[PDB]
Design a protein around this ligand. Structure first.
Ligand SMILES: OC[C@@H](O)[C@H](O)[C@@H](O)CO
Ligand SMILES: OC[C@@H](O)[C@H](O)[C@@H](O)CO
Ligand SMILES: OC[C@@H](O)[C@H](O)[C@@H](O)CO
Ligand SMILES: OC[C@@H](O)[C@H](O)[C@@H](O)CO
Ligand SMILES: [Mn+2]
Ligand SMILES: [Mn+2]
Ligand SMILES: [Mn+2]
Ligand SMILES: [Mn+2]
Ligand SMILES: [Mn+2]
Ligand SMILES: [Mn+2]
Ligand SMILES: [Mn+2]
Ligand SMILES: [Mn+2]
Lengths: 385, 385, 385, 385
């Protein structure tokens, strides 16, 4: 199960670079040089990296230092053949962002958050990224009077609409991907799920510039079915990017390596991305546990990739198995994919077999055969066929 | 705190009529006649009632019996001055709907679910309802291979699009309100939140025919902030109807009387509906606990109405209190409501005070004063001013 | 992966016999005769069955009918070689139990709940059961003033203490196993977790008569780590019985077949029961989904057994793998099992290497190597070694 | 609603002193001097403070600096009349504790964690504390093979048993209070609930030395009923101390001021502590939100105290209201407090009115009148009587 760069595996600088500072505990690992991580991730078989502005250029860097940091970084990309498919802005760490960036109550902060963003879209385009992520982690509230949500959506729509004006004015090929999260670090975060983000995009001036960046662990923090939300994103044409990780239920945001957490969810998510032909990056947004030294870092990043490739093999065996395709017909998946009434409304209304003469008892008696199907999918996952 | 019918309080027949059958236990109360409940709810000060088809006309009734049931019911509405603002279809009880109605894997079932719906839209319009709710409680799965979600959304969009064709062909003034729920009775239900429902409507052929019917307890079963979801629905123009009840956290769907459960949520929700000028029905979709006899039924329905009217008084005192309006300015709510950059993109880009000369430290030092605000809102709720 | 009766697999009559009545829906399957289920479960390789009183003898049966029902049942046990290791009381279905059995506010109800219990302990002993389960599913409240919890624990301790007097007075070899559940069908249920049940037993007059019956899905409905709770029960000597099933997170009690739900939890639970040498019944307390016909019933019961036996094989390969035992030493599991201070308190206090000269930096730098361990356990589960 | 020191309100140095560093964000407030906080908390009406070792004496302080820090602190206690009822150890911040203190896999770490503890019990006794808290925040795992839980409970019991030997050997009047938490910062924390902690104490050599320190927000992070767990702790005689705060459901540990979060829980908890006559400290273990400056700090600490005193007044009015005491009898709370069978087992067995002649229908028909009771308790809370 060996990754190659053709598998499209990517990692944030902040993921392998997490020093292991948590709400109760100091760092347990020294800071990695971005150079270092590029080199070590290319050896493991990754395809590229991603960054916040602030991961690559230290906050408050002179323009003399910015350019330095960028030079070095670009040399290591040249030396390794790594790409930069996606970039994003840190609008959550510095204290100025303690009430948000694009929805902060202070208007000055809000203009500062769009200037800091625009600066990093230029760099992102220079470095070749196709997708620009926006996680509004400070956009929200711990209290009901602190934030009027209708005014805060007006602000959010204004900031995204100015960024879409900027990008079309510059000529850039770059799209935006909004990342939902339901809570943490705010008490409640605005656009908390995939469905809220999808809905919001349909109100922006140019909706075809924006899609979603869902993360495994974030929709599971609301107790939702991650493969069902991604289906919906796929159904809308809006799955621009995806963050892969693991999460054990409804609790703080664990960011465990991909395959950890809900491992059957993980199986149905790979099944779906592979059968829909998702062709963007398989990005890992994870934190190696603070228990680990640098050995455990690179082990944990390697197991992200491994577990994807194992689950891809088992989902492919599942769909390719004749006894499975027979089960799928027994459970009427074929019929789910046929129109209910291609005949149209009038013919439906005149069809007596639809109502007046429909035998509800006979229909109700038929078994759906779902459990036999599900066990087939379990035997496939476990390799126990 | 006395309701009158001008408060727009409504109840489902199924709410006061719940016999108290639960997954572990038999009925504890006899069946109410719909007549009875209309009379008793008009005495308590309610404005109207709502129904499933199957609450009012027993499943499988001849057309001779349907008309009877409807006659009787209409007399009791005449005798009491009660209205029928909303109606809906039962597509969840009968065993034929064990895989869903509009997304069942069997195509025959799906045509039967639209015929059963259309029949009840006619009756709904006859009885004067303005809103037709659709809760797809059986639309979903307990297992990943049982349902392809992209085909199931195609089916759902086809069923809603044929119902919008039906209503515009008949000339009816009636809109649809889709009610989300994340789970129960299915393992996972499709369009599980407000945001998923909002997103989905924007893909139907005629989106201005459809809005949402959110329920308190349903978004809390995902751990989400119910007043934040309703703000978003208000912001989209799509809050057609609302279900009011109480829920203690993430667990089975409790349906406790309104004000029970999360009582500070309840306060910020009344604050919002009243300050936005929501003017639809305040509908109660609750179940009096099976511990209660008919005395406890009508006590529980009365406390729904009482608790709304108490929280309306305290939210109104809150917003009317000068010291509160002063706090709101101290916390910059005023600034949240101003555009970030009415000057436009170019002027933002040329403004040095937005970036080059923005003092981030000074901005970061300012306190948001949220806690003083929040305690004011607490003293108001508790009447301890 | 073929079960035999030596695997100690058991099922409740109520599990395969669930008609599929849920809070929103009628039965979807006819009632099974207990005879039938005994015969069909013996063919699949099960070791025995369990019952509520009310599953085997219809509520209100004359003593002429009781004996009949029991005769028939006993013949089918004779004909099949099935055992009855465990029995329990239904103190939740009938409306008289709407406030509880042993903690109902009415004292008359409470005496009735102990008489109904004692009657079924006699039958249980006749039929050879070793364990008598008590799930207090109606013991609790939806509201804070409805139940004083300290008086309700006095009542619960009084009922269990009289049942322990009864059993020691009759000479019976039978122990009690209390089953925790956090909620459903009550808003909150008393002794909601394993730890609450364990604590409570230590206050009964004869604590060595009582242990716990934990269920997978119940501790997961609180978001807790089921293998950690069973370790604690094992550590106390109190794991008398266990209920096996699957649950997807914090929501209504799904009762999916064992292996469904949290499949990595399932792996670490089999690892533990097998390495501790648990030798009681592996009981399945599950409901085949109401989507299924009788074919899907017996498929779902068979997959419970299958998935146990697959996970037993993979946990055994895991612990037997030298590279795994090497990893365990690398992560210091060996040291966890050594006493911290067998030298005693004084020697600890005089040991300078424990404090004055302990090098905290060097210790802090050591990696725990947990991620490499965890991936080994993942490759083992998936059979990808 | 003015606190005085006779109300027994206390605060941790770490609570008002939280700089607002979170998993995504830098500090937003400078460090407070312990002196400062003592002075400011005495002005607001608090009764005392509590500390970790490491809050009061910087980690790695020479013994020349320790004594200095302690001198200063003691002067400010003298100048203000503040007490120190409780102290505890920081065994979670420093990287050496990344796998735990008392259950770390490294035995060296474990001896170091008991030496660091013992040192601070001496200081605690010097400063007059009565209760010594132990929150094992690093005791647990993110992965199943990382920790054998039975060996880890052996270690935990060994560490607590040596601390009980230490304290009885020194002659100290000091008891231990174990604080449960279900998760965060570990994936799962050992003894995750009140009931697990209660159970564990009953296995220590001297159980009458140990009780529990429950925190509001921690049992709510498992979705449990905090007043029900404290009743159980009261029922066992083991409520040594309590941490008061607010939490909105199952998510990261918010630590909002007391009264925020679940405000009806807050009401029933004050009702219980006041009617049981709890006479330990009312300690606040909260964090003023990082949005706040020092003004918002002291506002947030003041609202903890205010909200306790408002809820005490409304619970007292509730229990003192004749119409309430009438409701309580209508709902049979009186009967809950009577023995079920003071007559004994034999008389129960011979009582025909308990079984043979018990009218189950009549009993089942009686209403429990809980909803009327609950609304009375709501009108009382809101002051709407
Ligand atoms: O929860 C943290 C979020 O996942 C971020 O890592 C975003 O993906 C990028 O800012
Ligand atoms: O959870 C059940 C749902 O709330 C229904 O009562 C809908 O509102 C109407 O079918
Ligand atoms: O949740 C229901 C409980 O699990 C019961 O099935 C008990 O095990 C036996 O009464
Ligand atoms: O969650 C953090 C815990 O509540 C601590 O503050 C303990 O109370 C003391 O170490
Ligand atoms: Mn995350
Ligand atoms: Mn992410
Ligand atoms: Mn509901
Ligand atoms: Mn509803
Ligand atoms: Mn269960
Ligand atoms: Mn069970
Ligand atoms: Mn806490
Ligand atoms: Mn605490």
């Amino acid at each position: 199960y060996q990754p190659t760069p053709e598998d499209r595996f990517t990692f944030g600088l902040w993921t392998v670079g997490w020093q292991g500072r948590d709400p109760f505990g100091d760092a347990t690992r020294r800071a990695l040089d971005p150079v270092e991580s590029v080199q070590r991730l290319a050896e493991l078989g990754a395809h590229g990296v991603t960054f916040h502005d602030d991961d690559l250029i230290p906050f408050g860097s002179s323009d003399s230092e910015r350019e330095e940091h960028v030079k070095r970084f670009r040399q290591a990309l040249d030396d390794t053949g790594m790409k930069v498919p996606m970039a994003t802005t840190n609008l959550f760490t510095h204290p100025v962002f303690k009430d948000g960036g694009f929805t902060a109550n202070d208007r000055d902060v809000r203009r500062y958050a769009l200037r800091k963003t625009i600066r990093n879209i230029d760099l992102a385009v220079e470095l070749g990224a196709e997708t620009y992520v926006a996680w509004g982690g400070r956009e929200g509230a711990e209290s009901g009077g602190a934030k009027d949500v209708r005014d805060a959506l007006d602000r959010m729509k204004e900031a995204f609409d100015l960024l879409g004006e900027y990008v079309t004015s510059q000529g850039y090929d770059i799209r935006f991907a909004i990342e939902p999260k339901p809570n943490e670090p705010r008490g409640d975060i605005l656009l908390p799920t995939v469905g809220h983000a999808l809905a919001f995009i349909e109100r922006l001036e140019r909706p075809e510039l924006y899609g979603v960046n869902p993360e495994v662990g974030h929709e599971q923090m609301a107790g939702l079915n991650f493969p069902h939300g991604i289906a919906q994103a796929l159904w809308a044409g809006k799955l621009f990017h995806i963050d892969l990780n693991g999460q054990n239920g409804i609790k703080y945001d664990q960011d465990l390596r991909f395959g950890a957490g809900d491992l059957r969810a993980a199986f149905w998510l790979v099944d779906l991305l592979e059968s829909a032909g998702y062709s963007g990056p398989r990005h890992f947004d994870f934190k190696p546990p603070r228990t680990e030294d640098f050995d455990g870092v690179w082990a944990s990043a390697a197991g992200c990739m491994r577990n994807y490739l194992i689950l891809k093999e088992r989902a492919a065996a599942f769909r390719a198995d004749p006894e499975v395709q027979e089960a799928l017909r027994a459970s009427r998946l074929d019929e789910l994919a046929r129109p209910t009434a291609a005949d149209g409304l009038q013919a439906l209304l005149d069809d007596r077999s639809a109502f007046e003469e429909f035998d509800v008892d006979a229909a109700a008696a038929r078994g759906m055969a779902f459990e036999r199907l599900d066990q087939l999918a379990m035997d496939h996952l476990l390799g126990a066929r």
